[PDB]
């Protein structure tokens, strides 16, 4: 398994044409604020490929 290539999966809005994002803040799907740690609706934005 080659876990060197990753991809962004969770976002809060659509991206603009020819846009590049560097911030890797955790996604929030619920009303509960994510205090920098994972939880019920607090997931990591970057996901690795196999």
């Amino acid at each position: 398994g080659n876990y060197n290539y990753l991809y962004r999966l969770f976002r809060k809005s659509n991206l603009k044409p020819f846009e590049r994002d560097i911030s890797t803040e955790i996604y929030q799907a619920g009303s509960t604020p994510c205090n920098g740690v994972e939880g019920f609706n607090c997931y990591f934005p970057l996901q690795s490929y196999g």
């Binding site: 999966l9 969770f10 996604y27 799907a29 619920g30 009303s31 609706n41 997931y43 996901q47 196999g50």
Partner: peptide, 19 residues
């Protein structure tokens, strides 16, 4: 913010993590 979006997010995460 609703239950459907959270359910779809959890389902996508599980499908991507279990494969």
């Amino acid at each position: 913010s609703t239950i459907e979006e959270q359910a779809k997010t959890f389902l996508d995460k599980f499908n991507h993590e279990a494969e």
